[PDB]
RNA sequence: AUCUGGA
RNA sequence: AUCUGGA
């Protein structure tokens, strides 16, 4: 019933009129101290990798340092920063700054002590924002001091391959087309983000570029805005009604939002959606839940804190089908570990499709169409993805 | 449950 | 994208 009273909506922008955006300026001393920490750790070989990139579109020759951690390092207690996605720079006047700040690393239920359901009830306060987890690759956008718009993927920017478009360049091309539609320029977006001292955080979803799990055809393809972060060492993020307002003003597609006050209603909603893996007539792969947390409870200040809840089925089966389809075209015996009966039928359908049209083999080997193949099989059986997973 | 090690 | 040894 809770999955029928709560619906993900993209119309919270009208409710942002009374809300005020967070803002904090950068302290060069604090930034310098952060970079001193990270520069030492990259020289110990708590491991850190540092990669320097030139910003091609910068009129002043700006450069950025990307800093990458081991994903498990973020469980350690005293790191310099818990940002996942971090680019630093020096302006033309020599001031060291954070150019791009992703979200803090966040974890699944029962992956860490803090993400045990008992810990979430204890240490967190609502309201709780459930944001729909779209599935592609992350794109960061910010504005440099010289007016340049910076577009990055998780850890990189620019293009290496002359043949293949990098993820960061593909995100930039989608942003270009999105601004031209609404008569705005990259320079305009760069000045607004720098004014807010902010990184916009979006998901690139486009099957013509790269297929993942769910299908994003032409009607659903583009940049999905899901966060805005302050470019500072600690983690401060916009409320999601303001994120949706920003998306409308700058031509991003919006990320569905549900607001639930009580934490017990949250688990109830999530464990209910998990049975189908679908909500509001749409396949959902997960939610990111956003709230407030403190150190020792009821004391100290409250900080922005996330956790994710990812639905295992029918998606674990879809990955098995993708892996088995790769086995067919490469001459290997598919590894059918679970969902044995329904998977064996899927493979006979696939072998059948590759006989009619041999051009499919070349497409499936370029990692394209495997998602259309899956839905065409499910249509052929009159089944929904969640039903094939429950056949047991 | 918990405690502890690696990645 | 997160797995894993032991008591
Ligand atoms: O485990 P994981 O890679 O799925 O980690 C989370 C990643 O999911 C992407 N994403 C998509 N939608 C969201 C929302 N609403 N909030 C936060 N992250 C989101 C990001 O690319 C992230 O790295």
Cis peptide before A28 (omega within 30 of 0): no
A66 CB near ligand 1 (under 6 Å):
no
- Name the experiment that determined this structure: X-ray
Give the whole-angstrom CA distance, residue A69 versus residue A107.
Answer: 15
Give the whole-angstrom CA distance, residue A227 versus residue A142.
Answer: 12
List A260's β-bridge partners, or say none: A128
A244 CB near ligand 1 (under 6 Å):
no
Strand order in the sheet with A48-54: A48-54, A63-69, A86-90, A96-101
Residue A214: DSSP 8-state: S
Residue A85: DSSP 8-state: S
Q: Where are the domains of chain A?
A: 2-310, 315-389
Query: Who among residues 51-70 of A has its Cβ near strand B, under 7 Å?
Result: 70
Pocket test for ligand 1, best of A82, A203, A252 (most atoms within 8 A of CB): A203
Where are any strands of DSSP class E within A42-106? 48-54, 63-69, 86-90, 96-101
A129 CB near ligand 1 (under 6 Å):
no
Q: Would you tell me the crossing angle of helices A340-356 and A370-380 to the nearest 10 degrees?
A: 110
- The angle formed by the CA atoms of residues A75, A83 and A95, to the nearest 5 degrees, is 140
Q: Strand A149-152 to strand A198-205: parallel, antiparallel, or no bridges (unpaired)?
A: unpaired
Neighbours of A210 (CB within 10 A): 16
Cα A80 to chain centroid, rounded: 23
The fold for domain A2-310 equals D-amino Acid Aminotransferase; Chain A, domain 1 (3.30.470)
Task: Provide the CA A107 to C1' C5 distance, Å, integer.
Answer: 22
Query: For residue A139, what are the CA distances in angstroms to A24, A136, A166, A269?
Result: 22, 10, 12, 29
- Cβ contacts of A219 within 8 Å, gap of 6 or more: none
Which strand C nucleotides have any atom less than 7 A from protein CB atoms? Answer: 1-3
Look at residues A29, A48, A26 and name the one whose alpha carbon lies nearest to residue A39: A48
Locate A284 and state its tokens: 């959902």
């Amino acid at each position: 019933s809770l999955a029928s009273r709560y619906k993900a909506s993209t119309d919270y922008a009208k409710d942002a009129e009374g809300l005020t955006a967070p803002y904090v300026s950068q302290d060069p001393q604090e930034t310098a101290a952060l970079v001193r920490a990270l520069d030492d750790a990259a020289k110990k070989g708590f491991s850190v990798k540092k990669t320097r990139y030139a910003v091609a579109s910068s009129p002043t020759g700006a450069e950025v340092d990307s800093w990458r951690f081991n994903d498990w390092d973020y469980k350690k207690p005293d790191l310099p920063t818990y940002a996942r996605g971090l680019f630093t720079t020096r302006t033309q006047h020599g001031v060291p700054e954070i150019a791009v700040r992703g979200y803090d690393k966040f974890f699944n239920i029962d992956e860490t002590r803090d993400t045990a359901w008992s810990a979430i009830r204890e240490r967190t306060k609502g309201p709780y924002e459930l944001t729909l987890k779209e599935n592609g690759c992350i794109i960061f956008i910010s504005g440099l001091e010289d007016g340049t718009l910076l577009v990055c993927s998780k850890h990189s920017t620019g293009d290496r391959s002359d043949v293949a478009l990098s993820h960061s360049s593909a995100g930039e091309k989608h942003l270009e087309a999105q601004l031209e539609r609404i008569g705005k320029t990259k320079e305009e977006l760069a000045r607004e983000l720098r004014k807010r001292n902010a990184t916009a955080v979006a998901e690139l979803c486009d099957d013509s570029f790269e297929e993942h799990i769910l299908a994003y055809g032409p009607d659903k393809a583009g940049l999905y805005l899901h966060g805005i972060n302050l470019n500072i060492p600690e983690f401060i993020t916009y409320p999601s009604p303001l994120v949706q307002k920003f998306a409308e003003d700058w031509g991003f597609r919006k990320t569905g939002l549900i607001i639930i006050d009580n934490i017990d209603d949250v688990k109830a909603f999530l464990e209910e959606v998990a049975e189908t893996g679908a909500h509001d007539g749409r396949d959902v792969e997960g939610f990111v839940i956003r709230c407030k947390k403190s150190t020792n409870p009821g004391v100290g200040p409250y900080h922005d804190w996330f956790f994710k809840y990812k639905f295992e089925e029918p998606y674990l089966m879809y990955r098995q089908w993708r892996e088995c389809t790769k086995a067919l075209i490469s001459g290997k015996q598919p590894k059918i570990k679970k969902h044995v009966k329904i998977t064996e039928e899927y493979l006979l359908y696939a072998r059948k499709r590759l006989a009619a049209d041999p051009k499919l083999a070349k497409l499936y080997n370029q990692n394209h169409g495997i998602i259309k193949l899956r839905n065409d099989f499910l249509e052929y059986k009159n089944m929904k993805g969640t039903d094939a997973a429950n056949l047991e």
